[PDB]
Write a protein that binds this ligand. Structure first.
Ligand code: KGA
Ligand code: KGA
Ligand code: KGA
Ligand code: KGA
Ligand code: KGA
Ligand code: KGA
Ligand code: KGA
Ligand code: KGA
Ligand code: K
Ligand code: NI
Ligand code: NI
Ligand code: NI
Lengths: 260, 260, 260, 260, 260, 260
C-alpha cells in the first residue's frame, strides 16, 4: 500500500486515487513519489489501462505545484528531476493508456499533469487554469510544450497570459477534453471506456502511444537557441518579481509586479 | 478505363468514384493501383480539382486494409511501398486539391487515406473509426503522423485506443471534417466547392499545398530514435498477439490478446 | 505622433488604432513602418499589453497587401525584409502580449498579421479571408507556417484553396479566434482582458511567449528541401498567371488563370 | 552516342571522359546535359562503378562555371535547376560509386562537382581552387554544404576566403583526396580500385551510399533561418560588387570590390 | 569471472580482454553479453577508465559481426536489439572513457565497435577493414553514422565500397586512430594515458562525453526519410545477392553478385 | 584607444593585439569587453580581415578563464551572457574573416576562442590544451560543439579527457591549424594571407561565412534532450569535485577527485 494514493484493480483496469487531501493534492514530492511507485507497480502484462482520480466528491482535483517546496534563492524549480517533470515523463512513457478522470478544480502543474495523460474525461462542474504568471515562474520548455498538443496557440496563450479558469464546456470546445459528463455518471462512463480499451491489443496500443510521444517531442532546435532560452529563464528566476510572486502567494496578498 | 474506379470530368473537376463494392472498397493492391493510375492520368492542366467518392447510397465508404493481403507475421505490414503508403504519398504530393466526399462508414487505412486528402465533406450519417488495435497491428510512424494534423492528441488517442466509431457531427466538432451536409445535398455542395476552387490560381494552390506538406512532415528525429521505434514495431509484428488478431478477424471471432 | 496610427495608453495598456482608412488599412510600407515605430516606442517596462484595432465602425479591418507595392518584374513580393514579413516577426518577438481586436473584414496579409498576434477577439459581424490564390501569389513558407498553429490542416486548406470568407462564428469554432462578442461590447471586453493580463508577471509572460515562439518555429528541414521549395516559388512568380492575377486586380476584373 | 562526353566500358566499370576541351570542360549546360544523359544511360545492373575524367594529358580538368551563361538582372545562377545543382544531386543519388579521376587544374563549380563524388584519385601535378569570392558570387547553402564533409571548417574557410589553389599533396593531407599517384599510374591505380569495387555487393553499396547521403544532408534549420540567408544572398546578387566581379572576369582584369 | 572476457584492474583503470579466440572474438551474442556484463560490473566510482583489448600476440583483434547469427533473408540483420547495436550504444553512453587498444586485424562490426569507443591506440602492424559489401548486408543508419565522426566522407566511402584493409599508419593519417605504437610498447603507452585520465574530474569527463554523444547523434530527418531508407534496406535483405553473400561465406568461396 | 588591447590597421587588415600580459591574457570580463569593443569598432566597410594575436615573444597566448571570476557557487560560469560565450558568438557572426595568429601556449576557453575563429596560423613552438577536466567544470553544449568542426571525435576526446598539451605540428596534422610557421616568419606569413583575402569580394565572404556558421550550428535536438543535459551539468556544478577542482587551482595543489 501507499501513504498518499489508494489503488483498486478491476480486471485489467487500475484506478489510482489521490489521498493527499490535507494539501488538496498539491504536487508535493512525497505525493508524486507514491503516485510514481503506484504506476511502476502497475506496469504488468495483466494491467491494460490506468485511471487517475481525486476522491469522489472532491471540490479540488489538485491545487497544483506545492509552493512551500517550489524553491526560491536562484534555483530552477522546474529542473529535469523535479517531481512534476518526473511524473509527466513517466505518464508519457508508460506503455498503457492513462486516463485523467477529473472532478473538481485543476490548477497549474496539475493542469500540465492531466494534459500529459492520454485522455481526459471530466465532470460538468470541473474547472481548469494554468497559473505560472500569477507567481512570476518561468515555466520550462518541455512543460510549455506539454500544453500545446490539444488547443491552438491563441487559446493556449489566453490560458497562460490570463491564468483565468475555464469551464469543462469550454475545455471540451477547444479540444483539451475528450468527454464532459454529469458528476454522477463520471466513474461509470470512465470505467466503461477503460474496460473497452483493455479488450484491444496491448502491444499495438503501447507502440502507437510511443510513436505519438516521439512525434509530439520532434520539435528540434540548435544548442544556441536552447542556451538563449535558459539564459532568459535564469533572468526570470533571479528577478525581484519572482521573489514578490512567491512571497505574495505564501502571504495570501496580491503581488506587485514591476518588470525586473 | 479502369476495372476498379469510374472517372467523370465536369468542366475542370474530376470525380474518381470507387468501383470495388463487392469487397466494400477495401484497399486491395488491385484497387489502389487503379486509383493511383486514375489520379496520374488526371495530372493535366485542364483538371483543377479532384473529388474521391464511393458510389451514391454506399453503406461502407471503404472497409480499410485488405486483411487477406497483410503478411502473416515476421514481416512489416506497412512498409514504404505497400499500397496505402504509396497512395497517401501520391495524394499529398498531387499538385491539385483532392477532396474526399464521404458517404457511409470509413475504417482504418481508409480513415488514414481521407485524412491525407486536402478537404473532407461528409454525409450526416457517415461514421469514422481507426482500427489497428483491433488486430494488434503496429501502425507505422508516417501513418500515425498523417492522423495528427487536424484533431488534438487526446482526441486522436481516444480514436486509436478505443477503435470506436465517431459520428460526422463529432468529427466536425474535433476538426477532422470541413463540412457535414444531408446526404441528398452532398454531391451538389462538394461539386460547387470544387468548381469554385477550379477558378483560382493553380500554381499558387500547388506551391502552397507543397509548403503545407513539407511543414507537416518537418517533425524531425535522430536515427537512434527511428531505429528504436522500428525495433518496437518489429516486436509487435513478431508477437503471438498479432497472429491471434489476424486469425480472429479471418475466423470472425473475438481475439484473446495476452501481451506477447 | 504618427501619420498612419493613433496610440492611447491608459495605465499599463496601449491601444494602437489604424489611421489609414482612406486605403482600407492596406499594408502599404508607410503604414507598416508607422505600426512598427509605435510598437517599438511602447517597448517600455510600464506598458504590459498591446491592442491592435481599426477605428470604431470600420467595414474593413485591413484590405491586406497593397497591390500597388507588390513587386512585378521577377522579384519575390514576400522576401524576408518585405514589410508584412518584418511586422509578423516583430509582433512574435515582442515581449508583451499583443491582442488583435477585430471589427470588419480581414483580407490576406492582414489575416496572417492577426494570426501572428497572441489573442484575437472579434465582433460577431467580422469576416476572415486568405486570398493569395485570387492573385496567383506563391505565399512564403514562414507566412504559411504562421497560419497553421490554430485550426487544423483540412480547415487551413479550405480557407486558402477557396479564398472564401468565413464568419467570426466559424473562425471561433475552428480555433482561430479566442472570443466573439457583439460589436457594442468589443472594446469593453478587450480592455477588461488586456487590463487583467497587465496585473500578471511580465517577465514570466515574456519568456513563456518566447518559448511558444521557438517551439512553433521548430519545424526543421534540410537545405535541399528549402532550395527545392524556393525553386517552386520562383516558377510561380515568373508565371503568366502571376502577371494575369496582378493585372486583373488593377483592371478590376476577374482573372483567367491557365496554369503557367 | 554523345557530342560532349566519350564513354568506355571495361567489364563492369564505365569511364566517362569529358569532350569539351575547347572550353576547358567549363560547366556549360550542353556539356552537363550530356554528362547527365551518359550517367543515366549507365544506370543498369551490369554497370557497377563509374569513373569521371578529363582526357589524358589535360592541363585543365574543368574551368568551372561558364561566365557566358550567368543570366544577369540579378537572377540566381545557383538556383535549384541550374546545371551544376542538377549534376551534384544526380551524382549523390546515383546508386553506383562515382570516382573522380583527376588530371589537371580543378576550378570553382568543378571543385564542388568532384567533392560531390564518392572518391577522388588525383595526379601528383593536379591543383584545386574554390573561386566564388573572385567574382562576388553568393554561393548557395547546398553547394557550400557539399564542401564541408571532408576537410575541417578552418581549412574550408581558407580555401574559400583565399580562392588560392592547393596542391594534390595538401588536398590529400587535409582529407579532400583519397590517393595521389604519379600521372603515369593514374589510370592503372583508379581502374584497379574500380574493378575491385565492382566485385562487391551492388545493392549493399547503393543503400549505404544513400544512408551517407541522407546523414550528410541531415543538418536541419527552421524556415525563418533559410529565408534570412536567402535575403542575404539576394543582397549580394543585387550588389555593385557582383556586377564588378562578373565584368572584371569578362574583361580579363582584376576586380576592385568596395563592399556594396 | 566471465566465460568470454578476462578483467584486470590496475589502480583506477580496468582492462577488459577478450577470451573468445576460438571464433577469433567474433561478436556473438554470448561474447557481447559478457562484455556488457563486465562493463556494468565496472560502473563504480573507483574505476575511472576502461581499456578494451584482445589477448597479447593476437593475429585477429576481432573477426566482427558473427555471420552465423545473421538471419537467412527476409529479416533485418541489424535490428535495434542485435548484439553489435547494443554494445555500441552501451560504450557510447558509458560514463567513463573507453579506450580501444588494438593488436591484430579488425573486421566489420568490430571496426564499428572501436569507432564507437572514445580513443583508439593501435600497434604499428594492426589493420582495419569495413566488410558488409563482401556479404551483401544492408548496414543500418546508426551503424553507418558511427563511422562518420573521425575520417571524411571520401575516406569512409573508400573503406566501405572497397572493403580493403588499411594500415595503422593510414588510419592515423586520416583521423581514425589517436596513436600508433610498436606492439612491445602498446600496453604501457595505453596504460600511461589511462592512468593520466584517471587523475582528472570524472563527473566533468562523463557530462562532456554525453554532450559529445548527443551532438554526434543530432543529425535529424523526418519519418518519411527514415521509412524510405528502411524500405531500401528491406529490398537488400530480401535480395538474391544477400542469400548469395551468406552462402558464399558458409561454403568459403567468392560470392557472385548480380544486383538483385 | 583601449586599456587591454592595441589595434593597428594596415590598409584593409586590422590587427587586435592583447595587452593583458600581467594576467597572461586570461579571459577576464574587462579584457573580453575591450576585445569586443575593438571588433565592433572595426566593423567598417574599409576593413576586410581581422588578425587576433598576443604580443610578439609571448610565452602564454592566453591562460583561458579567469578562475578569480567564478561567480557565487551553485551557479553556471558558462551561461549564455558570460564573456567567453559572448565573444565566440561575436567572432562567429562577424561579417569579416578573423584569423587567430598564435604565439605561445593556449589554454581552455582561449582554445575554444581560437577554434571559433575562421583560420588559425601558429608558431612552430606554440602548444594547445583544453583544460576543464582539470577543475571539474561541466563545459556547456555550445562550447563543446565549437571544438568539433576541425579534428575528429577520437582526437577531440583525447584532448579533453587528458587535458594534455599538443604541439603545433600535431594540431596541423589533426586539422585544427591552417599553417605552422617559424616564429620569425609568423607575422609576415599571416599579414600576406590577410592582405590577399582583403582583395576578394567582402559581401560574398560574409554570406558564405554566415552559411557555414548556420550549417555548423544545425545539429538539432528536442527540448527533453536539452533539459536532460542541463540537469547533468547542474549535478556537476553542485558536486564536491567541482569545489575541490576550483580550490585546488586557487591553492596551487593537485586536486583529489572522488566522483561526487
Ligand atoms: C505550476 C504552477 C502552480 O501549480 O501554482 C500553484 C497554483 N495553485 C493555486 O493557485 C491554488 C492554491 N490554493 C488555493 O487557492 C486554495 O487552497 C483553494 C484550492 C482554492 C482551496 O481553498 P480552501 O479554503 O478550500 O483550502 P486552503 O485552506 O486554502 O488549503 C488547504 C491546505 O492545503 C494547502 N495548499 C493549498 N494549495 C497549495 C499549494 N499550491 N501549495 C502548497 N500548499 C497548498 C493550504 O496551505 C492548506 O494547508 P494548511 O492547513 O497547512 O494551512 N505554477 O505556479 O505555474
Ligand atoms: O473573471 P475571471 O475568471 O477571468 O477572473 P480570475 O481572477 O482570473 O479568476 C477567478 C478566480 O478563480 C480562481 N481560479 C484560478 N484557477 C482556478 C481553477 N482551476 N478553478 C477554480 N478557480 C480558479 C482565481 O484564482 C480567482 O480567484 P479569486 O477570485 O479568489 O481571486
Ligand atoms: C488500420 C487497419 C484496417 O484498416 O483494418 C480493417 C478494418 N475494417 C473492418 O474491421 C471492417 C471489416 N468488415 C466488416 O466489419 C464488415 O464487412 C462490415 C463493414 C461490418 C460490413 O459487413 P457486411 O455483412 O455488410 O458485409 P461482409 O460480408 O462482412 O463483406 C462483404 C465482402 O467484403 C469482404 N470484406 C469486408 N471487410 C474486409 C476487409 N477489411 N478486408 C478484406 N475483405 C473484406 C468480406 O469478407 C465479404 O467478402 P465475401 O462475400 O467474399 O465473404 N488495421 O486493422 O490495421
Ligand atoms: O459501442 P461503441 O460505438 O462505443 O464502440 P464499439 O463496440 O467499438 O463499436 C460499435 C460497433 O461499430 C463498429 N465499427 C467500427 N468502426 C466503424 C465505422 N467507421 N462505422 C460504423 N461502425 C464501426 C464496431 O466494429 C462495432 O461493431 P460490433 O458491435 O459488431 O463489434
Ligand atoms: O488581394 C490583396 C488582399 N486582398 C484583397 O482582396 C484586397 C481588396 N479586396 C477586396 O475584396 C475589396 O477591395 C474590399 C477590401 C472588400 C473593399 O471593398 P469595397 O466595397 O469597400 O471597395 P473596393 O472597390 O474593393 O476598393 C476601393 C478602392 O481601394 C482599392 N483597394 C482595395 N484593396 C486594396 C489593396 N489590398 N491594395 C491596393 N488597393 C486596394 C481598390 O482597388 C479600389 O480601387 P480604386 O482606388 O481605384 O477606387
Ligand atoms: O598565388 P597564391 O597561391 O598565393 O594565391 P593566388 O594569387 O590566388 O593564385 C595564384 C594563381 O594561380 C591561379 N589558380 C587558381 N586556382 C588554380 C588551380 N586550381 N590550378 C592552377 N592555378 C590556379 C590563380 O587564379 C592565380 O592566378 P594569377 O597568377 O593569374 O593571378
Ligand atoms: O561483417 C562481417 C565481418 N567479418 C568478416 O568479413 C571477416 C570474416 N573472416 C575473415 O576475414 C577471416 O576469417 C579472418 C578474420 C581474416 C581470419 O582468417 P583465418 O583464415 O585465420 O581463419 P578462418 O579459418 O577463416 O576462421 C576461423 C573460424 O571462425 C570463423 N569465422 C571467422 N570470421 C567469422 C565471423 N565474422 N562470423 C562467424 N564466424 C567467423 C570461420 O568461418 C572459421 O570457422 P570454421 O572453423 O568453422 O571453418
Ligand atoms: O584553468 C584554465 C586553464 N589555465 C591554466 O591551466 C592555468 C594557467 N597557468 C598555467 O597552467 C601555468 O601556470 C602557465 C599557463 C604555463 C603559466 O605559466 P607560469 O606557471 O609561469 O605562471 P603561473 O605560475 O601560473 O602564475 C601567473 C599568475 O597568473 C595566475 N593565473 C594563471 N592562470 C590563470 C587563470 N586561468 N585565471 C586566473 N589566474 C591565472 C597564476 O595563478 C599566477 O597568479 P598568482 O600571482 O596569484 O599566484
Ligand atoms: K534526356
Ligand atoms: Ni508541430
Ligand atoms: Ni505464447
Ligand atoms: Ni554534422
Amino acid at each position: 500500500a501507499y501513504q498518499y494514493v489508494n489503488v483498486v484493480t478491476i480486471n485489467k483496469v487500475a484506478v489510482i486515487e489521490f489521498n493527499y487531501g490535507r494539501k488538496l493534492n498539491a504536487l508535493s514530492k512525497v505525493f508524486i513519489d507514491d503516485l510514481m511507485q503506484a504506476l511502476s507497480d502497475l506496469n504488468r502484462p495483466e494491467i491494460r489501462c490506468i485511471i487517475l482520480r481525486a476522491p469522489s466528491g472532491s471540490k479540488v482535483f489538485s491545487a497544483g505545484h506545492d509552493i512551500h517546496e517550489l524553491p526560491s534563492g536562484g534555483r530552477d524549480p522546474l529542473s529535469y528531476d523535479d517531481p512534476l517533470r518526473q511524473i509527466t515523463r513517466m505518464i508519457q512513457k508508460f506503455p498503457k493508456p492513462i486516463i485523467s478522470m477529473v472532478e473538481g478544480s485543476v490548477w497549474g502543474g496539475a493542469f500540465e499533469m492531466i494534459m500529459s495523460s492520454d485522455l481526459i474525461i471530466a465532470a460538468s462542474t470541473s474547472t481548469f487554469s494554468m497559473t505560472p504568471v500569477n507567481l512570476g515562474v518561468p515555466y520550462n520548455l518541455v512543460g510549455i510544450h506539454n500544453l500545446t498538443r490539444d488547443a491552438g496557440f491563441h487559446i493556449v496563450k489566453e490560458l497562460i497570459f490570463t491564468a483565468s479558469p475555464i469551464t469543462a464546456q469550454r475545455a471540451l470546445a477547444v479540444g483539451i477534453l475528450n468527454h464532459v459528463v454529469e458528476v454522477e455518471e463520471l466513474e461509470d462512463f470512465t470505467l466503461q471506456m477503460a474496460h473497452h480499451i483493455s479488450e484491444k491489443a496491448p502491444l499495438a496500443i503501447a507502440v502507437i502511444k510511443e510513436e505519438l510521444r516521439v512525434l509530439g517531442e520532434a520539435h528540434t532546435m540548435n544548442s544556441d537557441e536552447f542556451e538563449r532560452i535558459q539564459g532568459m529563464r535564469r533572468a526570470v528566476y533571479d528577478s525581484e518579481d519572482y521573489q514578490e510572486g512567491m512571497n505574495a502567494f505564501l502571504e495570501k496578498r496580491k503581488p506587485n509586479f514591476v518588470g525586473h
